Each structure stands twice: as C-alpha cells, then as structure tokens.
Amino acid sequence: IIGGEFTTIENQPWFAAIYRRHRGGSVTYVCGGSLISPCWVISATHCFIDYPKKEDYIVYLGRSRLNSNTQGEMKFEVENLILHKDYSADTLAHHNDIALLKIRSKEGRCAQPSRTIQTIALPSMYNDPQFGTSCEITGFGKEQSTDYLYPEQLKMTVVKLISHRECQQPHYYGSEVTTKMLCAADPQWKTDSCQGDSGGPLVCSLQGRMTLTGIVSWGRGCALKDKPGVYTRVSHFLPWIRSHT
Ligand SMILES: N=C(N)NC(=O)c1nc(-c2cncnc2)c(N2CCCCCC2)nc1N
C-alpha cells in the first residue's frame, strides 16, 4: 500500500495473509486474501500460478504483522487450491484473476470467528457502487514502488471507483481493462495498491453493508498518474464462486 495508514487486523478482520514454504524451509509472503466463509479464502490466481501445489502454502487469519505472530491468530494449510480455468496473462493485465483456497488446520478445523477474524459479504450479482465511491484496500504490499522490503505492519488506504469508460481511455489502460475488471485510484494518484497487495480486498459499503467488491489484481507502476489500480470485479464471478464453494 502506497500512502494510506497503518492499521491492525481488527479493522479488516476478513484479511488473510498467504505465505509459501520452501525449498529448504524458509517461509515467505505471497499475497493477500479475504475470508468469505469459515473454510474459504478468496484471492488472485496470479499469486499461485507459478507454484500451483496446495501443500506449499500457509494461510493466516487474525494476523496484523508480516513476520511476527499476532495474538489470537489462526494458521491453516490449504486443503484445496482452485485457480480460474480461463485465467490468462497479458503483459500487465491478468484476465479472470481469481482463486479460492479451502483452509484447514493441523486439527482439521476451519476459521472460528473472533474480534480479529470475521467473514466479509460478497456483493449481490452485477451490483457495484457508482463511480466516485470511496472504497478501502488492505495489504502488506510495498510502501513505495522502489522498496525492496514489505512493511512489517498491515496497511490500508482509500481509493475511488473509476468508470469502465474512463479507465478504457488509452491515456489510462486502453483495451487492457475489461468489464470483469474494476479500476480505482486516488484523485491525486497519491495512494494505491502495489506489489504484495495482490489478492487482497477492495471493500465498499453497499446497501449499508461492507462488501467484497474487488480483489487486487494489477496495475502499471503504483500510484502513477493515469494508471489506476485494477481489481477483479467480484460481482461478475458469483456463479464461479458459488459452484466452487
Ligand atoms: N495498483 C497498482 N498500481 N498496482 C498494483 O496493484 C500492482 N502493481 C505491481 C507493480 C507495478 N509496477 C512495478 N512493480 C510492481 C504488481 N506486480 C507486478 C510485477 C510482477 C507481478 C506482481 C507484482 N502487482 C500489483 N498488484
């Protein structure tokens, strides 16, 4: 997250932190996700496509810090890793950038909700907020494009939804952006998602309810003028989500 503010998991208790084992046993951060039911985390396919083996991954819920344990956190193995069959990689733009992880502990259990661990509602079909609506993004991604490190403390920021029409102008992303993607950005291009925030939530208030509107997918640079963040448009994937869960 470029700009924005530090936060803790209590403020975004559906946030999932996804890591990968090595290869010698070191464990490194991969991507964010969102808890949509006790046993299911939703994320982005591009996070896992290079290492598509479920046994390599560890999922934490209730975690506020990158490399230290947060009190009350839960740790899971991935019982099931479901990548979207129609995924494709353009140079920048990933299509159908969506994935499901069925989570299960050593003890064979799913997430127990708590103050630090809650589910997030999916939107009703094809129902998104109007452009200019303020939504929030959360992640452990880079604080600056040039950074080598990820922040140790979770961050969040606010971005505004951009219309299909505005985002498809060539000055922005041209044809790279489809109707199954959503754009969002700061009017000053001052704050944004970045590398390491992939798979995490774009949450908007809909019908007076916090709703998973988007999943961090791609962008050119981070917090670059005329280059919004691009998000998987969750309201266009409900049949896929329902079927595979
Ligand atoms: N909103 C945004 N402007 N950007 C992003 O959300 C985003 N940006 C980047 C990126 C953009 N430019 C420079 N470095 C990283 C990125 N990469 C891309 C390189 C390899 C794959 C994963 C890491 N992933 C993102 N999800």
Side-chain angles (χ1 to χ4, degrees), residues 28-44:
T28 68
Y29 190 69
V30 173
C31 277
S34 304
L35 191 72
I36 55 165
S37 60
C39 307
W40 291 97
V41 168
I42 201 167
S43 192

Side-chain angles (χ1 to χ4, degrees), residues 94-111:
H94 306 266
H95 297 235
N96 301 301
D97 196 11
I98 191 171
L100 288 159
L101 290 83
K102 194 174 190 169
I103 52 164
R104 164 161 94 181
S105 66
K106 301 282 195 192
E107 317 91 60
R109 296 196 265 290
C110 292

Side-chain angles (χ1 to χ4, degrees), residues 46 192-195 198 216-223 227-230:
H46 89 252
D192 205 352
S193 52
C194 205
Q195 178 171 340
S198 293
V216 182
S217 186
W218 64 277
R220 152 108 277 273
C222 306
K227 310 296 155 193
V230 192

Side-chain angles (χ1 to χ4, degrees), residues 7 19 21-22 39 41 54 59 66 69 74 92 96-97 123 137 159 213 219 232 236 241:
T7 189
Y19 301 71
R21 282 170 189 105
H22 289 59
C39 307
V41 168
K54 66 216 253 272
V59 178
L66 228 213
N69 302 286
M74 287 188 287
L92 274 333
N96 301 301
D97 196 11
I137 47 173
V159 290
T213 294
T232 298
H236 286 39
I241 294 160

Side-chain angles (χ1 to χ4, degrees), residues 2 16 60 118-119 121 137 175 190 195 207 217 220 229 241:
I2 308 306
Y60 289 91
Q118 292 290 319
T119 61
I137 47 173
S175 187
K190 165 194 174 58
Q195 178 171 340
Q207 315 157 331
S217 186
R220 152 108 277 273
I241 294 160

